[PDB]
Every structure is written in structure tokens, then in C-alpha cells.
Amino acid sequence: LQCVCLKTTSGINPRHISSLEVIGAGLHCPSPQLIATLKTGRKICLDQQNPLYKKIIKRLLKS
Amino acid sequence: LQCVCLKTTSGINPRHISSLEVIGAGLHCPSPQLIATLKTGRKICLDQQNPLYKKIIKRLLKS
Amino acid sequence: EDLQCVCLKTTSGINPRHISSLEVIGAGLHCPSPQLIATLKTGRKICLDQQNPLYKKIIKRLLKS
Amino acid sequence: EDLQCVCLKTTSGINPRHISSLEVIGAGLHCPSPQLIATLKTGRKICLDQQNPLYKKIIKRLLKS
Ligand code: TCN
Numbered sequence: 001l002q003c004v005c006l007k008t009t010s011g012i013n014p015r016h017i018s019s020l021e022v023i024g025a026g027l028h029c030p031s032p033q034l035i036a037t038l039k040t041g042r043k044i045c046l047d048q049q050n051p052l053y054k055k056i057i058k059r060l061l062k063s
Numbered sequence: 064l065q066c067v068c069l070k071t072t073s074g075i076n077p078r079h080i081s082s083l084e085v086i087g088a089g090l091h092c093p094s095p096q097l098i099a100t101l102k103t104g105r106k107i108c109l110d111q112q113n114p115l116y117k118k119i120i121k122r123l124l125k126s
Numbered sequence: 127e128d129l130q131c132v133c134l135k136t137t138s139g140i141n142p143r144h145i146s147s148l149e150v151i152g153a154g155l156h157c158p159s160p161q162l163i164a165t166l167k168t169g170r171k172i173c174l175d176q177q178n179p180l181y182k183k184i185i186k187r188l189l190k191s
Numbered sequence: 192e193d194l195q196c197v198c199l200k201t202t203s204g205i206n207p208r209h210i211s212s213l214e215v216i217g218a219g220l221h222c223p224s225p226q227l228i229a230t231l232k233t234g235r236k237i238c239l240d241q242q243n244p245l246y247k248k249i250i251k252r253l254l255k256s
Contacts, residue, residue: 004098004106006069018169018219023212024253028105031256035067035106041146041165042091043084043098044065048254057250061225061241063218081234084149085184088191089167095189104212104230111189120185123152124160124176127199129228129236132221134195156197156236163194171221172193 003029005045012036012044014055020046066092068108075099075107077119083109131157133173138180140164140172142187194221198228198238203245205229205237207252213239 016038023033034046034053046053079101086096097109097116109116147165151157162174162181174181209231216226227239227246239246 001072001105001107002070004067004108007066009065011065017217019214019216021212021214022250022253023104023106024210025256026105026211032254033106039169040089040167041086041169042089043067043086043096044091045067057215060215060217063225080152081154082149082151084147085188086147087145087188089146093191095191102234103232120150123150126152126160128202129197129238130195130199132194132197135193137193154234 001028003031003033005029005033005035008034008045008047010047010050010052012038012046012052014052014059016040017056017060020053020056020060064091066094066096067098068092068094068096071097071108071110071113073110073113073115075101075109075115077115077122080119080123083116083119083123129156131159131161132163133157133161135173136175136178137172138175138178140166140174140180142180142183144168145184145188148181148184148188196222196224196226198222198224198226200238201240201243202237203240203243205231205239205245207245207249209233210249210253213246213249213253 018039146167149163151161214228
């Protein structure tokens with residue numbers, strides 16, 4: 001089918017993230033999809049091009 | 064602005080859905096969001112106009 | 127054996143309007159029963175009982191906007 | 192006390208090619224430890240060991256176009 005993450009964002013605070021999901025590319029979407037869940041319930045798409053996502057993964061692996 | 068769901072789908076088979084999340088409108092996104100995760104780990108957005116979602120809630124709960 | 131259900135117990139006095147998200151998980155190898163996890167806007171997470179129509183009120187409330 | 196850890200046991204013998212998605216969940220009220228849940232292409236879920244680098248390879252794989 002198709003990508004869900006058509007619009008990505010970087011205007012977010014690592015500290016507000018509670019979880020991150022990486023969906024690999026395949027027939028449904030030619031690129032990886034990174035969906036972050038804020039602590040308040042909201043979900044946003046991250047851009048793999050920004051390294052923000054690597055900071056998120058370190059903070060999550062810490063706590 | 065920061066919506067995950069920019070484009071929906073009404074073409075799926077509920078059999079394939081492992082979970083459904085209902086997100087309310089807020090500051091990131093002005094409209095409710097219906098994200099379905101397929102058994103494979105892939106996500107799709109559903110239309111709240113189409114009641115397939117209702118079909119899907121029923122099936123997940125009485126399963 | 128590898129994984130267990132995330133929901134220990136269910137809660138029932140919540141106000142449909144304190145919820146920012148509702149997640150419906152089917153039964154599977156991961157957990158033998160379907161689960162209803164609601165996120166309060168405060169970030170607290172609770173599980174609801176599918177045998178309480180409260181979840182239907184939340185879903186109605188969440189689709190509003 | 193409504194939620195608990197879903198990850199009981201971790202797995203180390205998986206082919207990075209079988210994984211379709213990975214979820215990293217930080218610690219909090221629900222579980223005092225982070226959890227790495229992978230969904231294989233088969234619909235099956237498993238927990239990865241973070242103090243093992245099998246997960247590093249998977250991340251790298253999942254990030255390729
Ligand atoms: N009950 C329980 Ni746990 C177990 N076994 C874990 N890990 C938790 N929380």
C-alpha cells in the first residue's frame with residue numbers, strides 16, 4: 001500500500017518522548033518510518049535525515 | 064501541521080489488523096486519528112467517515 | 127512465556143474528557159485477551175474493562191474534535 | 192499498578208532480515224526498564240537485549256532504503 005508518514009517533523013523535545021517505533025521499508029513504503037509517541041498521547045513522524053532521532057533512542061535506552 | 068494521518072484507506076481486511084489506536088484532536092493535529100497496525104508491524108490510517116473501523120473495533124474485542 | 131499482557135488491572139471512574147488516546151489490542155500470542163489502554167492527557171495510562179460501556183463513550187468523545 | 196512489563200525474556204537468535212519493525216519504550220510507571228520489542232515479518236513479537244548489540248544491527252537494517 002502506502003506510507004503513513006507523509007509529513008515529518010523535528011520541532012520536538014526529546015525529553016517529551018515516551019516511545020519510538022521504527023518500521024522498515026518494504027512494499028508499502030520505500031523508506032523507513034519513525035513514529036514517536038509523546039508522553040501526552042500524541043504521535044508524530046520524525047525525519048530520518050535529522051539526527052534528532054538518535055538522541056531520542058539514547059534517552060529512551062537510558063532511564 | 065504535525066498529523067501522522069494525511070491520507071486514509073478503507074480497503075483493508077480486518078483479519079489483518081492486530082491493533083487500533085484512537086487519538087483525539089489537539090495542538091499537533093486538528094482531527095482525530097485512527098491508526099491501525101497490521102500483524103506485520105505496518106500501520107495505516109483509517110477514515111472515521113467509513114465505519115470499517117467500527118467493524119475492526121468489534122472484531123478485536125470479541126476475539 | 128516471552129511476553130505478558132501490559133494490563134495488570136482495569137480502572138473505571140474516568141471522565142471521557144481527560145483522555146487523549148485509546149488503544150485497542152487484539153488477543154494474540156502476546157496476551158490472550160483484548161486490551162483497552164487509554165492515555166490521560168497527563169500521560170497516565172490505565173486499562174479499561176471491555177465489559178464496561180465506558181470505552182464506547184471515550185471513543186465517541188475522541189472522535190469529536 | 193494497572194500496567195506491568197510485557198518483556199519477560201529476551202531473544203538473541205534472530206535473523207535481522209525477519210524483523211519488520213522495532214519499538215523502543217522508555218522506563219516509567221509501567222516498567223522500571225526500557226523494552227525493545229521487535230515484530231518479525233511473520234507477525235510474531237520478541238524482546239531484544241539492549242546490553243547485546245543484535246539490536247544495533249537491526250536498527251541499522253531498518254534504516255536502509
Ligand atoms: N509481575 C511481573 Ni514482571 C515478571 N515476571 C517483569 N519483568 C513486572 N513488572
